[PDB]
Amino acid sequence: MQYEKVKPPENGEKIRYENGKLIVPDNPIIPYFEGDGIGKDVVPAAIRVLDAAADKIGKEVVWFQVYAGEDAYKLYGNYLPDDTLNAIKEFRVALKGPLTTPVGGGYRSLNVTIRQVLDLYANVRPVYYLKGVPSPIKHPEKVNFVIFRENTEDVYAGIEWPRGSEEALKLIRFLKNEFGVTIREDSGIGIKPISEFATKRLVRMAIRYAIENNRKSVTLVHKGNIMKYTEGAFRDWGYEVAKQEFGEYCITEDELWDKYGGKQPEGKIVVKDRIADNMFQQILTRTDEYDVIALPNLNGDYLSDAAAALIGGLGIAPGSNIGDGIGVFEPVHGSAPKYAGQNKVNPTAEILTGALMFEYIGWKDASEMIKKAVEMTISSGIVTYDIHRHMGGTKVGTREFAEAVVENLQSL
Amino acid sequence: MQYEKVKPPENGEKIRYENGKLIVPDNPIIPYFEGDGIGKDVVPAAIRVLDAAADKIGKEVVWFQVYAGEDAYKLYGNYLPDDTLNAIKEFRVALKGPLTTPVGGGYRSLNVTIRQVLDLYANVRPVYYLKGVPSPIKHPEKVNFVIFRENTEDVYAGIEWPRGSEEALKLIRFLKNEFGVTIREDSGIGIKPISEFATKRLVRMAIRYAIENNRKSVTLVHKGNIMKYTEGAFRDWGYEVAKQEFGEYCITEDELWDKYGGKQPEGKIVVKDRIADNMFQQILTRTDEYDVIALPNLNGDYLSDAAAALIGGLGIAPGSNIGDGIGVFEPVHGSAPKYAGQNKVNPTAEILTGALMFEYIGWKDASEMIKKAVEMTISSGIVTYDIHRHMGGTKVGTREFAEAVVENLQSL
Ligand SMILES: [Cl-]
Ligand SMILES: [Cl-]
Ligand SMILES: [Cl-]
Ligand SMILES: [Zn+2]
Ligand SMILES: [Zn+2]
Ligand SMILES: [Zn+2]
Ligand SMILES: [Zn+2]
Ligand SMILES: [Zn+2]
Ligand SMILES: [Zn+2]
Ligand SMILES: [Zn+2]
Ligand SMILES: [Zn+2]
Ligand SMILES: [Zn+2]
């Protein structure tokens, strides 16, 4: 690719993507940017940990520092340059730290435009428990999900207009004359679009994941009993993909009971569905019963934040945005201005999202090694500010914490 | 008021609604109906407990039996007859069992028409812990919320059209050519209206409730960071109700710290706001910081279910649908056909709903006595089979459970 104010490294190898299969080297070049505030601290930390987890299983990563945020407005005059985008476009996995939405924008607008120009349609969140991390629940150890969230549409597509505005007012009056529907005039208005195409590729991804990692089930979560033609369609469209594209692998829950007596044949993945508002109960009492979960945008967000709270909270949650043969990896957490000062914030989220990057790369044995080592060190009592909370009497800084997990990794 | 196939009782007095107020005599006539299946068990049981609570406090409910569901159908040819709707309209407050929505109609439809004709715009749910109920979390006793959910608008109002229907395609095209919004045509399409009127009605009642019952706070829950003109509007309209209608009582969080140094003078209500997806953590880790919660329709449903899940579940949840000087009190659970008549099901939810009804009509002390009685009974390990599953104890029938809460009620 042609790069402006930064060149790739002479020492690396591209990851490639033919068919739908991702071809990964032993020395892949993977771009990353520190991003804003806290990122200057946590991303370096994840790097050192991933460095050691790489060189532990006879491989190496060749990091390609690109830029985003302040670093970029300082350098290109722009917060999200062509270079950065084009680096991921070319190299297909990136590790990112958190961004700050510049004065003017809209919520997480730099993260919006990244998923847009790169077509990252799925937010993928693994939720699991590490021993030693504090939990508000009695049985956090039973929690083990991977959540696949459609991330392009639903109410979160930002299609809406304020009360009393001319566009709002025309929509309401349109809906009156055309369909005889009557929306009070003093109303703000949004629109909720869910499409066959977008539902079907998110689910197709979740199922393929289940097959490929032999998870026992895929659960479709929807509110299709009140919202028949948006949420209810997500369900019908998700079932269709299981039924029409994966009949080798997928059986319904009707099929589980009548045809298989309730036995789970090897190879087969159960595809089931649960009403969204009941899932909050299900992850608390039937935690055992869910692995891969596939959800629309809103439900995806709520359920996955609910699940993280069981397991130690959002501050340590690893995230991902994924499309076709391409992925971008950041913690679910923001950039926090102050961070108590420097070197005091928790790198665990970034480290574990680093681990998630390796899983998507194929090096899932190295991902596992990172999880165990993060655990061994949190269990030891070595923790930063945020987990000294409910085990108070041992501290240690951001750098010192990453080093201590490095200690534990090399110790296999 | 006229009655086709029933007659109101000989010996009571109407509760009255004058100025903003219920005027409740010692002997109110209150209509009720058993409803379907499980209803023939738990409603009579709740009645036994409410009679003992009223008597102990110098009061009497003159019950007025009316019908809905099957019983109504046989008696009237109408699953939801005129006299039932009218009895509630005349006598203002009603206790109900659950209703199976019959073969092929508007969803939880009987309950839906009830709240439409009677204009019950708030769904109100107390969430609190009773010792002796199994709980998945570490500090259940910190849970003490009352959730006010706007129950007339939002995506739950079913304004919505299937993919490729003329109605949908015409809406999609209109949005493309009028607002420059491109919606994929393989989309089903809903609309999310949120109006001043509905919102201010809900928030008003929530803040009144907090004043009348000395609750420390009202939290507005919304996803207005992403949905500026719907949820965001809910937020701001709620703040306007606080400042402009309840200025003598309501302080913002900023005021709490500026004006009172973070204390909380007695009599001031903190009105604050929080992001809906952040709320699942909050109710688990900062659970003592929340009291009165006011939400729009969909957030209200997810959050209140997720709160019931902390405390023993939906099987035990009291519920309320409320309007201006009018209220219908139902448990949250359905009619669970397969158990009908067995003297098996747990009547705690009806019982607790009866208590919620007592608060509504101003008998707060009786209300407190019934919750207390239920605790003591369950604490003792006197439990119906649902709790017995998990706790062990003395398995007891529906009736003997009620007999046991009566005997506890009388010792207090
Ligand atoms: Cl978030
Ligand atoms: Cl009739
Ligand atoms: Cl429900
Ligand atoms: Zn356990
Ligand atoms: Zn199709
Ligand atoms: Zn089809
Ligand atoms: Zn979220
Ligand atoms: Zn240091
Ligand atoms: Zn009296
Ligand atoms: Zn106004
Ligand atoms: Zn619900
Ligand atoms: Zn027993």
Residue B146 sits at φ, ψ, to 5 deg, of: -130, 125
- Check: CB of residue B298 under 8 Å from CB of residue A155: no
- Which residue in A has a C-alpha nearest to residue B231's C-alpha? A188
Residue A320 sits at φ, ψ, to 5 deg, of: -165, 145
Strand partners, A13: A28
| Distance, CA of A256 to CA of A394 (rounded, Å) | 50
Nearest Cα to B61, choosing from B71, B69, B52? Answer: B52
Q: Which of B119, B277, B288, B365 is catalytic?
A: B277
CA R_g for chain B: 22
Tokens encoding B193: 């209206």
The CA distance from B158 to the nearest CA of chain A, in Å, is 6
- Check: CB of residue A98 under 8 Å from CB of residue A37: yes
- Check: CB of residue B108 under 8 Å from CB of residue B101: yes
Q: How far is CA B333 from the centre of its chain?
A: 12
CA distances in angstroms from A170 to A163, A345, B183, B194, listed in the order given: 11, 49, 18, 16
- Check: CB of residue B203 under 8 Å from CB of residue B241: yes
Nearest Cα to B274, choosing from B265, B283, B284? Answer: B283
By CB neighbour count within 10 A (0-12 exposed, 13-18 middle, 19+ buried), where does A61 fall? buried
Region for residue A180 given its phi and psi (left: phi exceeds 0; alpha: psi -120 to 50; beta: otherwise):
left
Provide, as residue numbers in chain A, all residues whose Cβ is less than 8 Å from the Cβ of B225: 107
H/E element, A193:
strand A187-195
Hey, what amino acid is at B220? L
Instruction: Pick B189's closest partner by Cβ from A193, A276, A298.
Output: A193
Method: X-ray
Residue A335, annotated as binding a ligand: yes
| Distance, CA of A242 to CA of A203 (rounded, Å) | 8
Region for residue A327 given its phi and psi (left: phi exceeds 0; alpha: psi -120 to 50; beta: otherwise):
beta
Interface test with B, best of A187, A310, A387 (most B CBs within 10 A): A187
| Distance, CA of A123 to CA of A369 (rounded, Å) | 24
CA distances in angstroms from A295 to A154, A327, A365, B159, B300, listed in the order given: 11, 19, 28, 21, 19
CA R_g for chain A: 22
Q: Does the CB of B288 have a partner CB in chain A at under 8 Å?
A: no
Nearest Cα to A230, choosing from B28, B187, B370? Answer: B187
Q: Where are the alpha helices (DSSP H) in B134-195?
A: 166-179
- Check: CB of residue A151 under 8 Å from CB of residue A321: yes
What does the angle CA B236 – CA A194 – CA A109 come to, to the nearest 5 degrees? 50
| Ligand found nearest the CA of B392 | 12
DSSP designation for A316 = G
| Distance, CA of A319 to CA of A315 (rounded, Å) | 11
Provide, as residue numbers in chain A, all residues whose Cβ is less than 8 Å from the Cβ of B159: 175, 181, 183
Domains defined for chain A, CATH in brackets: 1-412 (3.40.718.10)
| Distance, CA of B106 to CA of A2 (rounded, Å) | 59
Give residue A117 CA to ligand 4 midpoint distance, Å: 44
Region for residue A52 given its phi and psi (left: phi exceeds 0; alpha: psi -120 to 50; beta: otherwise):
alpha
Q: Does the CB of B62 have a partner CB in chain A at under 8 Å?
A: no
Provide, as residue numbers in chain A, all residues whose Cβ is less than 8 Å from the Cβ of B158: 226-228
A175–B191 CB contact, under 8 Å: yes
Q: B73 an active-site residue?
A: no
| Distance, CA of A316 to CA of B94 (rounded, Å) | 48
Chain breaks in chain B (C to N over 2.5 A) after: none
| Distance, CA of A222 to CA of A236 (rounded, Å) | 10
- Check: CB of residue B52 under 8 Å from CB of residue B409: yes
Nearest Cα to A43, choosing from A99, A116, A107? Answer: A99
Nearest Cα to A136, choosing from B305, B61, B271, B137? Answer: B137
Provide, as residue numbers in chain A, all residues whose Cβ is less than 8 Å from the Cβ of B285: 136, 309, 313
Q: Does the CB of B119 have a partner CB in chain A at under 8 Å?
A: no
Q: Please tell me the total number of residues recorded for chain A in this structure.
A: 412
| Ligand found nearest the CA of A341 | 8
- Check: CB of residue B39 under 8 Å from CB of residue B97: yes
Give residue B236 CA to ligand 10 midpoint distance, Å: 10
β-strands A250-251, A321-323 pairing: unpaired
Q: B223 an active-site residue?
A: yes
Residues with Cβ within 8 Å of residue B254, at least 6 apart in sequence:
none
Residue B257 sits at φ, ψ, to 5 deg, of: -80, -40
B233–A281 CB contact, under 8 Å: no
Nearest Cα to A297, choosing from A108, A120, A122, A118? Answer: A122
| Distance, CA of A386 to CA of A378 (rounded, Å) | 11
Tokens encoding B83: 């006299």
A174–B179 CB contact, under 8 Å: no
The CA distance from B365 to the nearest CA of chain A, in Å, is 32
Q: Does the CB of A4 have a partner CB in chain B at under 8 Å?
A: no
Residue B101, annotated as binding a ligand: no
Q: How far is CA B100 from the centre of its chain?
A: 18
Instruction: Pick A228's closest partner by Cβ from B160, B187, B227.
Output: B160
| Distance, CA of A296 to CA of B85 (rounded, Å) | 38
B280–A301 CB contact, under 8 Å: no
HSE toward the beta carbon, residue A408, CA cutoff 13 A: 23
Interface test with A, best of B133, B141, B155, B167 (most A CBs within 10 A): B155
| Distance, CA of A207 to CA of B394 (rounded, Å) | 45
Interface test with B, best of A125, A163, A179 (most B CBs within 10 A): A163
Torsion angle defined by CA atoms of residues A350, A354, A359 and A361, in that order, rounded to the nearest 10 degrees: 140
CB atoms within 10 A of CB B369: 23
Quote the crossing angle between the two packed helices B196-212 and B231-245, to the nearest 10°.
Answer: 50
Residue A258 sits at φ, ψ, to 5 deg, of: -75, -55
Q: Which of A76, A121, A156, A209 is catalytic?
A: A156
By CB neighbour count within 10 A (0-12 exposed, 13-18 middle, 19+ buried), where does A328 fall? buried
Instruction: Pick B184's closest partner by Cβ from A197, A226, A227.
Output: A197
Residue A274, annotated as binding a ligand: no
Buried/exposed A357-367: b ≥16 CB within 10 Å, e otherwise: bbbbbebeebb
Residues with Cβ within 8 Å of residue B109, at least 6 apart in sequence:
B101
Nearest Cα to B28, choosing from B103, B96, B87? Answer: B87
Give residue B87 CA to ligand 2 midpoint distance, Å: 13
Overall resolution, Å = 2.5
Q: Which of A71, A273, A291, A301 is catalytic?
A: A301
A193–B170 CB contact, under 8 Å: no
Residue B81 sits at φ, ψ, to 5 deg, of: -65, 170
| Ligand found nearest the CA of B78 | 2
| Helices (H) then strands (E): counts for chain A | 14, 15
The CA distance from A118 to the nearest CA of chain B, in Å, is 19
Residues 154-213 of B with CB under 8 A from A: 155-156, 158-163, 167-168, 170-171, 174-175, 178-179, 181, 183-184, 186-198
Provide, as residue numbers in chain A, all residues whose Cβ is less than 8 Å from the Cβ of B228: 160, 162
Strand partners, A94: A328
Residue B217, annotated as binding a ligand: no
What does the angle CA A246 – CA B188 – CA A159 come to, to the nearest 5 degrees? 120
| Distance, CA of B192 to CA of B158 (rounded, Å) | 9
CB atoms within 10 A of CB A353: 27
Tokens encoding A383: 């923790």
Nearest Cα to A149, choosing from A288, A314, A303? Answer: A303
Residues with Cβ within 8 Å of residue A331, at least 6 apart in sequence:
A42, A97, A98, A317, A318, A319, A349, A350, A353
Interface test with B, best of A112, A161, A175, A277 (most B CBs within 10 A): A277
- Check: CB of residue B387 under 8 Å from CB of residue B375: no
CA distances in angstroms from B360 to A81, A247, B23, B122, B125, listed in the order given: 60, 55, 11, 13, 12
By CB neighbour count within 10 A (0-12 exposed, 13-18 middle, 19+ buried), where does B36 fall? buried
| Chain A to chain B Cβ contacts (< 8 Å) | 200
- Check: CB of residue A155 under 8 Å from CB of residue B195: no
Q: Does the CB of A314 have a partner CB in chain B at under 8 Å?
A: yes
Q: A156 an active-site residue?
A: yes
DSSP designation for B337 = S
Q: B258 an active-site residue?
A: no
B184–A195 CB contact, under 8 Å: yes
DSSP designation for A260 = T
Q: Does the CB of B244 have a partner CB in chain A at under 8 Å?
A: no
CB atoms within 10 A of CB A336: 14
| Distance, CA of B45 to CA of B79 (rounded, Å) | 23
DSSP calls for B9-31: -SS-B--EEETTEEE--SSBEEE
| Distance, CA of B318 to CA of B329 (rounded, Å) | 8
